[PDB]
Amino acid sequence: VKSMFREVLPKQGPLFVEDIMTMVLCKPKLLPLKSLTLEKLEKMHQAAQNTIRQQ
Amino acid sequence: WWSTILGDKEEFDQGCLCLANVDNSGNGQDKIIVGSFMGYLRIFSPHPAKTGDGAQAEDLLLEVDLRDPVLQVEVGKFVSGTEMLHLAVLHSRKLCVYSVSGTLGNVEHGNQCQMKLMYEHNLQRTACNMTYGSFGGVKGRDLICIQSMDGMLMVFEQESYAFGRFLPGFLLPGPLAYSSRTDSFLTVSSCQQVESYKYQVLVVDWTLNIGEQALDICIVSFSASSVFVLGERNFFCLKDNGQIRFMKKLDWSPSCFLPYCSVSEGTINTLIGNHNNMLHIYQDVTLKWATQLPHIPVAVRVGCLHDLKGVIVTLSDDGHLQCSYLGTDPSLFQAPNVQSRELNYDELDVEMKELQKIIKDV
Amino acid sequence: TAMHRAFQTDLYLLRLRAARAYLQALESSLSPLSTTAREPLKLHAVVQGL
Amino acid sequence: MEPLLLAWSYFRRRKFQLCADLCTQMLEKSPYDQAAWILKARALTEMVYIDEIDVDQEGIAEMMLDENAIAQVLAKALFEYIFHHENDVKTALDLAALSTEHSQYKDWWWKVQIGKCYYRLGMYREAEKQFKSALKQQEMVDTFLYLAKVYVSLDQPVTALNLFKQGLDKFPGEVTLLCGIARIYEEMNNMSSAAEYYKEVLKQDNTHVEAIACIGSNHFYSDQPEIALRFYRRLLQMGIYNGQLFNNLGLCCFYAQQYDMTLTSFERALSLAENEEEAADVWYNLGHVAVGIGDTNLAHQCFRLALVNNNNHAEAYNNLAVLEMRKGHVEQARALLQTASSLAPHMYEPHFNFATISDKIGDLQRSYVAAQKSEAAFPDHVDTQHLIKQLRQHFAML
């Protein structure tokens, strides 16, 4: 008499009965983590533009 | 755990910190010694300061200015006929020895030592650095060498200057040490040759090409005798004959290092400091634990802090002396060699979710 | 039950942040696609261009 | 003298720019001082100094940046060194050859360096005979990274294996050797024997960054999206704080069904993005989120903003025009796949997807050359082999 809480689930699903030729998407990509040489060489080259932007 | 900031716009490098009990106290509770590019020598003993949101007074015990650059300080037994410990202090053109005496005044800034210069030694050349060791095989006492700036060896016994010869293969001064067991003067010139000259009164004994220069050389034994050399990029471990025991390649660049005591036979533990404010503890090549630092160290020592073992002091080049910030428990690289106020809150928490007022944040 | 309301009010800013950046370029017509005159536009730097 | 010491003591704490001016302040005090001349040299060397190749450590790549989980799974010695940041290799090679003839042994450093000069230009074999002789006298870890660097560029994957088991038993448990061996296995996609070695560079050395992602990516594919998160929340706590990591942290929490950190991590990833080509890829991965909730109107303007922030994003042109074919715009879709293919002449997914639009219409000649390249760029596909044999029955007779 506390509670019913009876929500009966169907216990069955929509099984497939044939395969269908469909269109599939490109899959999501994890970006690479740049190395500590690539982080240094990009930072040096990014400052190489600003010193030639004034000269 | 503890912090301080000493001086103002004074610079430091390695060799400007030691950890010993120079006053020959019976309890053996070691004390800090801090040099500078000025003469402002300090001597510390930081009391256990709790988390009470206050700055405790009388942090410094004594302070004596010498109005001269202090290159490198060294503790050791430097008076003949006694087994006491004496602080040895190097200036750029003079060499001093200050036998420490505890004064009649006690703690809280009573100038615990007056500078009792036992013997000043005049210099013929300006020096780079130096080291101490019982050369020749004498017992109890320890003698003192001098490496000049252009490079020559002026050995000084506690009574007087002994003799002098030049250092071959010089182009630029490098670090220098004396092996206790194999009784040789181990150095490295600028031509990447780790050399070890014989003490006798020059022709080389044995060399080894190592590829680059090196900052600091340390030699410990515990038994296993082993010569450690931290290069600019790599990190060696030499056997006494000239055999590379192992190596390790470092992607970062190191700052200072110290191979303190071990936990097992054959193993020996080492601390390295980066320039990314990171510390690294090291069983022989195997990394064990690595946590951050507040700054870039320039010298590291390990001693005893108020009857606690496994203490790490981090002197910078600005005046920082923050030490042993209790990563998980302020222990040695041994498996919990000390608790040392290990009672704390936590380490390495899990959850990164905010979960507070995210609803109605629009 | 706290996780469901955390998703919606974070996704509700996401629809706004997208459309405020979508219309910021559609009025400037930055997109290489069209509907009225119906061609796309692809362009590239060629190997001889060095 | 205090200026000479303060110059050398600035080099020890590597204050470089404060060192070179104070050292050349001592330059006019003498006609020639050999100590200041090499200190002005060597402090100028370590301003920038890189050795290896651009070794940017992927997590999702097999060949020409393809995705995964749909495929499968004396004092002159340092004067020589000033030429090596300037990369004038031939001029350095003269005084390198001059000095090694001055002392024709006890210099393995000059032996391996001239071989590095030969590899810097392209003299493969002349380098390959050079520093092999230095290894037969000296045991150094970088020389194993020198012999086994030229051999992989000479394309012999079995000759790389012998060095990586020779020096591994003289330098036991060494880290960067164990990373070099698992890096050539990912070149041949030998992940059966690659990811065991990356479980050893994590056995000892538990904070090596470039072997934390390459395990935490090879678990996000092949259906361990919860374990792959644990390798990325730990990599956050080291404190690197990139924009690329808040992308990868956003993707792993969604596929592991952790809906709290799944999207705040993307808004922090949209911000603090370096280039304008880089904020495209965070909009693109946001599209795959938007297909997951089912909103297509949201998803249609996520690939579009990835496309206006960066054209020639070949994975988005295909991905936008599956959403078009869901609506009905056939001729619109068949031109985006037409230009997704011409940007990526690999990566089978536009090629196969062309041959299910152009097959339903009836053009069985272009829908063959479409599904021809969806076999050569990825064999062992299932629904290509149910399509070529669908077409080759039409081509013979009725």
Side-chain angles (χ1 to χ4, degrees), chain B residues 11-13 253 317, chain D residues 10 12-15 233:
Chain B
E11 288 182 331
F12 318 91
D13 68 305
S253 166
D317 45 346
Chain D
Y10 276 155
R12 155 172 287 158
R13 64 178 70 84
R14 69 172 48 238
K15 274 165 189 154
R233 293 168 71 92

Side-chain angles (χ1 to χ4, degrees), chain D residues 79-229:
Chain D
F79 192 64
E80 171 259 344
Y81 184 51
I82 200 156
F83 311 134
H84 279 39
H85 72 86
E86 205 66 34
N87 225 318
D88 196 341
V89 191
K90 293 288 287 186
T91 59
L93 266 165
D94 312 280
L95 277 76
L98 272 169
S99 160
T100 187
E101 292 316 293
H102 201 105
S103 65
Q104 202 36 257
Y105 220 63
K106 277 77 61 180
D107 48 356
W108 62 266
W109 159 247
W110 280 332
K111 287 291 188 181
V112 293
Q113 188 51 254
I114 295 167
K116 281 175 75 70
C117 307
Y118 287 155
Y119 178 62
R120 212 154 181 180
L121 302 153
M123 329 292 177
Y124 272 68
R125 159 204 156 86
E126 195 64 36
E128 283 144 29
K129 194 178 178 182
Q130 189 39 254
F131 43 78
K132 279 190 105 83
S133 60
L135 184 54
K136 307 302 180 291
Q137 205 264 0
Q138 196 35 257
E139 295 188 333
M140 294 299 287
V141 192
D142 42 355
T143 73
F144 287 91
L145 263 299
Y146 288 158
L147 273 84
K149 192 202 186 185
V150 293
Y151 279 7
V152 179
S153 46
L154 212 61
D155 293 332
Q156 294 102 27
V158 78
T159 70
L161 256 292
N162 50 57
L163 294 150
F164 286 164
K165 60 193 167 70
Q166 257 189 352
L168 208 62
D169 288 326
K170 274 81 72 178
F171 310 135
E174 208 279 334
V175 173
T176 181
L177 271 188
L178 268 163
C179 180
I181 182 55
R183 214 184 291 107
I184 66 156
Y185 279 172
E186 279 307 303
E187 208 56 53
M188 318 315 154
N189 192 216
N190 311 344
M191 75 97 67
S192 44
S193 80
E196 189 56 79
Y197 280 156
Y198 280 154
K199 216 53 185 189
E200 188 78 15
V201 200
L202 260 286
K203 181 60 66 69
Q204 54 89 25
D205 202 301
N206 50 6
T207 174
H208 189 66
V209 52
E210 324 279 12
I212 279 168
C214 316
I215 292 302
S217 90
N218 292 167
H219 292 179
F220 168 60
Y221 305 138
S222 86
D223 199 29
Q224 313 271 17
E226 184 59 78
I227 304 188
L229 180 62

Side-chain angles (χ1 to χ4, degrees), chain B residues 150-180 182-223:
Chain B
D150 51 352
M152 75 177 303
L153 296 186
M154 324 302 269
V155 281
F156 280 74
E157 298 199 343
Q158 308 324 307
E159 269 64 33
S160 171
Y161 168 67
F163 62 97
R165 289 294 94 197
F166 270 91
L167 266 183
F170 181 87
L171 305 166
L172 195 145
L176 188 133
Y178 165 74
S179 88
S180 158
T182 60
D183 54 274
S184 180
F185 274 60
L186 269 81
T187 185
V188 47
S189 162
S190 93
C191 46
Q192 307 166 331
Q193 301 301 110
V194 167
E195 306 163 12
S196 50
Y197 295 151
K198 194 54 196 70
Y199 167 66
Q200 55 91 42
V201 304
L202 196 70
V203 188
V204 306
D205 196 288
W206 63 267
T207 83
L208 170 71
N209 200 359
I210 58 160
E212 62 197 349
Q213 290 302 289
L215 311 186
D216 186 312
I217 316 178
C218 177
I219 293 160
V220 301
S221 313
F222 284 99
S223 159

Side-chain angles (χ1 to χ4, degrees), chain A residues 23-24 26 28-29 31 34, chain D residues 221 244 248 285 288 349 353:
Chain A
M23 314 161 75
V24 298
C26 278
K29 58 176 307 164
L31 280 181
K34 290 186 296 310
Chain D
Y221 305 138
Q244 279 96 62
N248 318 338
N285 295 287
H288 285 110
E349 189 55 46
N353 221 340

Side-chain angles (χ1 to χ4, degrees), chain D residues 175-364:
Chain D
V175 173
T176 181
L177 271 188
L178 268 163
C179 180
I181 182 55
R183 214 184 291 107
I184 66 156
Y185 279 172
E186 279 307 303
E187 208 56 53
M188 318 315 154
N189 192 216
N190 311 344
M191 75 97 67
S192 44
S193 80
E196 189 56 79
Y197 280 156
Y198 280 154
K199 216 53 185 189
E200 188 78 15
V201 200
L202 260 286
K203 181 60 66 69
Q204 54 89 25
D205 202 301
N206 50 6
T207 174
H208 189 66
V209 52
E210 324 279 12
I212 279 168
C214 316
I215 292 302
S217 90
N218 292 167
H219 292 179
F220 168 60
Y221 305 138
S222 86
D223 199 29
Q224 313 271 17
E226 184 59 78
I227 304 188
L229 180 62
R230 185 88 191 274
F231 274 64
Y232 271 116
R233 293 168 71 92
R234 156 167 184 91
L235 187 55
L236 174 64
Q237 267 154 352
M238 307 299 173
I240 37 178
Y241 207 79
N242 282 316
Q244 279 96 62
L245 197 135
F246 280 100
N247 190 16
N248 318 338
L249 205 74
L251 267 181
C252 301
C253 303
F254 181 45
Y255 278 118
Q257 315 153 342
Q258 200 151 359
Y259 308 127
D260 308 331
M261 292 73 67
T262 176
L263 191 56
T264 78
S265 318
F266 268 115
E267 283 144 340
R268 304 174 68 91
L270 265 300
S271 317
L272 54 93
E274 278 62 25
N275 299 303
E276 271 282 81
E277 68 96 15
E278 209 279 328
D281 299 28
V282 198
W283 274 117
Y284 164 58
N285 295 287
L286 213 56
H288 285 110
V289 180
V291 187
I293 316 110
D295 200 355
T296 303
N297 304 268
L298 209 165
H300 189 97
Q301 49 205 33
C302 290
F303 303 105
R304 271 296 268 275
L305 292 174
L307 193 51
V308 306
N309 220 327
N310 185 37
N311 65 307
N312 66 93
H313 196 224
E315 297 96 308
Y317 274 118
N318 187 357
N319 225 345
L320 161 66
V322 181
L323 300 169
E324 302 266 19
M325 191 64 203
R326 287 267 306 192
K327 294 195 174 188
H329 298 173
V330 169
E331 60 272 20
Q332 275 89 353
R334 219 181 65 198
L336 294 179
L337 270 66
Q338 190 66 252
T339 183
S341 45
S342 43
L343 291 167
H346 300 94
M347 199 196 61
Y348 85 111
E349 189 55 46
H351 288 318
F352 162 70
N353 221 340
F354 201 93
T356 326
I357 288 173
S358 158
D359 161 76
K360 194 48 76 204
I361 285 179
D363 192 328
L364 302 182

Side-chain angles (χ1 to χ4, degrees), chain B residues 80-123:
Chain B
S80 315
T82 184
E83 282 305 281
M84 291 158 194
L85 286 177
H86 312 84
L87 159 70
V89 164
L90 179 68
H91 288 301
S92 42
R93 284 296 319 196
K94 89 164 161 180
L95 161 67
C96 322
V97 170
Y98 304 95
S99 194
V100 54
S101 165
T103 48
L104 287 69
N106 284 318
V107 307
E108 60 95 23
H109 210 291
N111 202 1
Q112 299 313 291
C113 193
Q114 76 277 17
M115 281 312 117
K116 316 196 304 183
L117 171 58
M118 304 326 279
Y119 38 92
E120 193 270 344
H121 276 288
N122 47 62
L123 295 203

